[PDB]
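Structure, all two chains, one model.
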Amino acid sequence: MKQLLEAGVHFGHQTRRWNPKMKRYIFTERNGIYIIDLQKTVKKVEEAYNFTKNLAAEGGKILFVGTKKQAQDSVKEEAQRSGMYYVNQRWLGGTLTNFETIQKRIKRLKDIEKMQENGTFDVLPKKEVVQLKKELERLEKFLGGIKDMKDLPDALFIIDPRKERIAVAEARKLNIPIIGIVDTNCDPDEIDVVIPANDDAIRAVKLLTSKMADAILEAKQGEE
RNA sequence: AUGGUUGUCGUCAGCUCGUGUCGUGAGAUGUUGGGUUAAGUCCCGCAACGAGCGCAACCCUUGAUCUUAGUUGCCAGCAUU
C-alpha cells in the first residue's frame, strides 16, 4: 500500500536511452525523461507488500542487495534495522553462487571478530595485532553483512538493476526469487517482482528500502 | 633402464590448484587494470573468492651496548723487570 502522494517524490530516472523491455510501463516523455507509470508502481508495490510479507513469513532471510553511492544507507539502515543481512558495499564476486568460499570468508571474519576479545593482541608482537587488525579492518568493511545469512539467501531484494547485474545473474543461477526496483533504462524480464520506478533520488531509496524492509519487518514479528 | 646426486635458465620472479563464473570446446578468468617495490612485494579498483610452493622473515656472521662470568686472555689503578 504505497503512499500515492508520497510516491510523487520517487518517480523518475534516466531517459533518451530506455530499452523496449522496461519501457512498456512508461507513462509519457516530457522533455527530460520518460515519466514512469504511477499506477503500475502502486499495484506493483502492493505485490511486493503482500508477496514480500507472506513469502517473507515462511522464515527465510531477505538479501537487501544494494550497490550505488548513497544506496548503502537505505540497505544498511533498512536491513540492519530490518532483519535481513545485506551487502551495500562494492559487490562480492559470486555472492550466493560461491556459497562455501564466502562461508570461509565468514570464517576469517569469525576468528577476526572473536579474536578481538580472544586475546589476539598480546600474544605476538605489534605486527601481529597491527597487520591482523588491518585484516579484519579490511575484511569486515567489505564482507560483514553476510553474517545474517548462514543458510542460502532465500530471496534477493536487489536495489540496482545495472550496477548489481552480476547479482541478477547470481540469483539467475539458482531458482531463487529476485524482486527489485529496476530503473527505466533496465531489462524488464530479468526480475520477478518489478518495482518500475527510478532510483536516482535518495528519498526514492528510503521509500523503496523502507517499504521493502518495513514490509518484511512488520510481516515477520506478527506471530508472537 | 634407473635410484640417488649436481649444474644452468637464476635469487630472475615467477609457477599452480580447490571453489565459482564465462565459453558447445581447448582454454580463460584468479595471475589481468591503477600505482608502488628488488619481488605475483604491498595497497586499491576487478567476476571472482581462497589457498600451495616461491618472495620475504625465521638461522649464522658482521659494526652498538647491557647483564652473567674473569683464566691461560686484558693491565687502568700500585711496586716489578
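The first helix of chain A runs from residue 38 to 56.
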